[PDB]
Each structure stands twice: as structure tokens, then as C-alpha cells.
């Protein structure tokens, strides 16, 4: 097939900024290249066809360009609604192939997370499993290090993270880390702690509880 490579795969920009994404094909595709915007949990929206033709209704700040193998999309002045993932599509020769996509997100100031820890419910323990949940609320940038400490012992292999998309009001992220243990292992220990390292914090923050005490 023809291979389509996008650059960069993700990027941040501030409102009003000029943004350019590039799209490179493994061979000449005769400007049969289309650009799509996909917002999370939504279907793709067509933006440009034949490298540079705007689909009716797309704001004029969107512009596409290129020829041969090398093409680009450009947003002259970024606006809040332009966030999402942009895909380019080669439709010269079947199979029509897409690029990996460029994630466009909005820049904002560092924000430190509010951290909360949640012990397993008694109800859940009745079934023999204990999930311990740590929440990092409303922070920026996305990178954060969360470590679980049980009776001063680091945990490995028994925790999963999940991260929301940028909040539509304050452009922050939130993250949840879920520590899973058997009820037997859970009840053999006292201090369950969540340690959060993040650029918005001068030092790591820790939230903890002792199994048993209200």
C-alpha cells in the first residue's frame, strides 16, 4: 500500500497561534489528499479535499497546501474549537491509507493536582478483591509520576492509570491510579499511600489512610 506519515504526532499551541501539520506519502499521490478533524468520542469531520479545497462551512483560517508527496494543513489563528486529532488521508490508489494523526491540544500554565486517596469499600471486600484508588485532579502538564506505597513498600505490576482528555473549561487533565490487591493481601497491611510527583509541586505530595481507622 501507500504509506502516510504525519508530523508531529502531537503538539500544544496557544489561542491565536499559527499551526502547521505536515503529511508525507511514500509516493506521489497527485494531491488526492484529504484532512479530517476528530474530536474525542465523535465521528471524523471532513475539512479539505484535493490537498487544498475547503469543504463548505469550514472556517477560512483552515488552509491546506502541497504537491507530490509533501502536504500540509495550516490554521492561521488557533481557536478553542480547533482542538482534536487531525488525520490526513491518501486517496490516490486503493487501499486508501490514513496518517497516524496529529493530536492538537491547548497550552496553559502549570497547575498542580489536588490528590485524593480512596480505600476499598467494605462491599467490594465481601467479594474478595480490594481496589485502592488515587485521584489527581485538575493538573497540567499531563506527565505525572504516581507510586503506591504499602507499609513503606513500593508497588509494581498491580496498578493501572487512566487519564481524561483536556477539560473544556480550564484545559487541565485528571488522572486515576487504581491499585488492585486480593482481600488477603490487603488485610495484611496498614498504611496505604499514594505518592504524586509533578512539575506543579515543589516536592512530591502523598495522601494516605490506615486500613481500619475511620
Amino acid at each position: 500500500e501507500t504509506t502516510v506519515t504525519q508530523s508531529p504526532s502531537s503538539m500544544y499551541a496557544s489561542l491565536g497561534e499559527r499551526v502547521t501539520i505536515t503529511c508525507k506519502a511514500s509516493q506521489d499521490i497527485n494531491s488526492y489528499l484529504s484532512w479530517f478533524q476528530q474530536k474525542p468520542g465523535k465521528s471524523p469531520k471532513t475539512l479539505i479535499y484535493r490537498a487544498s479545497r475547503l469543504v463548505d462551512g469550514v472556517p477560512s483560517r483552515f488552509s491546506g497546501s502541497g504537491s507530490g508527496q509533501d502536504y500540509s494543513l495550516t490554521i492561521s489563528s488557533l481557536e478553542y474549537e480547533d482542538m482534536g486529532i487531525y488525520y490526513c488521508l491518501q486517496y490516490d490508489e486503493f487501499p486508501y491509507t490514513f496518517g497516524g494523526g496529529t493530536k492538537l491540544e491547548i497550552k496553559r500554565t502549570v497547575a498542580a493536582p489536588s490528590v485524593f486517596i480512596f480505600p476499598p469499600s467494605d462491599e467490594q471486600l465481601k467479594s474478595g478483591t480490594a481496589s485502592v484508588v488515587c485521584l489527581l485532579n485538575n493538573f497540567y502538564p499531563r506527565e505525572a509520576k504516581v507510586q503506591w506505597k504499602v507499609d513503606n513498600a513500593l508497588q509494581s505490576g498491580n496498578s493501572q492509570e487512566s487519564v481524561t482528555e483536556q477539560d473544556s473549561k480550564d484545559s487541565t487533565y485528571s488522572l486515576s491510579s487504581t491499585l488492585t490487591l486480593s482481600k488477603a493481601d490487603y488485610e495484611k497491611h496498614k498504611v496505604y499511600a499514594c505518592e504524586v510527583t509533578h512539575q506543579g509541586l515543589s516536592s512530591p505530595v502523598t495522601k494516605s489512610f490506615n486500613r481500619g481507622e475511620c
Partner: peptide, 16 residues
């Protein structure tokens, strides 16, 4: 904040 679902080791999904 309703987090994206996670695929657990048991093969069942989970979210907070």
C-alpha cells in the same frame, strides 16, 4: 471527571 475505561488483567473493563 468520568475516566476512560481501562482493560483490566481479568479481561473485564473498569472505570471510575
Amino acid at each position: 471527571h468520568t475516566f476512560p475505561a481501562v482493560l483490566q488483567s481479568s479481561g473485564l473493563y473498569s472505570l471510575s
